[PDB]
Design a protein around this ligand. Structure first.
Ligand SMILES: Oc1ccc(C(=S)NCCC(=S)NCCC(=S)NCCCNC(=S)CCNC(=S)CCNC(=S)c2ccc(O)cc2)cc1
Ligand code: NA
Ligand SMILES: [Zn+2]
Ligand SMILES: [Zn+2]
Length: 149
């Protein structure tokens, strides 16, 4: 049970950097976004996935931290992330266990005659800290997959 529902997700101003490579490796790079705004986030950090492969878990994505601040850091800039009408699925546990969440979103979309519209997002509601890793078994990750409206 991934608590699947359709959400009206409002626009978000983010500090971000572009990242190309394995999604798992993004966690080493995300701290640079927080450091650029002196940790002054006004929302949960997330990845916006533009090009991704489910099997290789590698592609092109933006590492995003919601903020009102002007970032100062190499390769950090600001994007106004657009409003999305999105399928929301919530995953509890480590990031390695998340392919089934996407299968559940695809099934839900197919059954409700909704058309998936990348890019999609993983929102780290409860995840690793900059220093403290915490318990990956209790991580809360919200997948937001936009649909055609
Ligand atoms: O207050 C603070 C302050 C500091 C911090 C810091 S610095 N914390 C530490 C930095 C942070 S925030 N780490 C966060 C966790 C990260 S970045 N994890 C890496 C990514 C995890 N996710 C994976 S490995 C899954 C990747 N997703 C795939 S492979 C899609 C698969 N599905 C696809 S391609 C598909 C499926 C079906 C479709 O129809 C169509 C696409 C935090 C809070
Ligand atoms: Na599939
Ligand atoms: Zn609205
Ligand atoms: Zn592939």
């Amino acid at each position: 049970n991934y608590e699947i529902e359709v959400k009206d997700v409002e626009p978000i101003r983010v500090a971000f950097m572009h990242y190309k490579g394995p999604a798992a490796g993004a966690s080493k790079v995300m701290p640079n976004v927080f450091k650029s705004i002196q940790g002054k986030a006004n929302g949960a950090p997330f990845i916006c996935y533009y090009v991704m492969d489910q099997q290789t878990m590698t592609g092109e994505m933006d590492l995003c931290v919601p903020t009102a601040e002007n970032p100062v850091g190499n390769g950090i800039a600001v994007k106004d992330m657009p409003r999305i009408k999105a399928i929301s699925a919530t995953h509890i546990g480590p990031y390695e266990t998340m392919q089934p969440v996407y299968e559940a979103i695809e099934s839900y979309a197919r059954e409700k005659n909704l058309i998936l519209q990348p890019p999609f997002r993983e929102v780290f509601i409860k995840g690793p800290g900059m220093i403290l890793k915490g318990n990956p078994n209790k991580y809360i990750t919200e997948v937001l997959f936009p649909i055609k409206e």
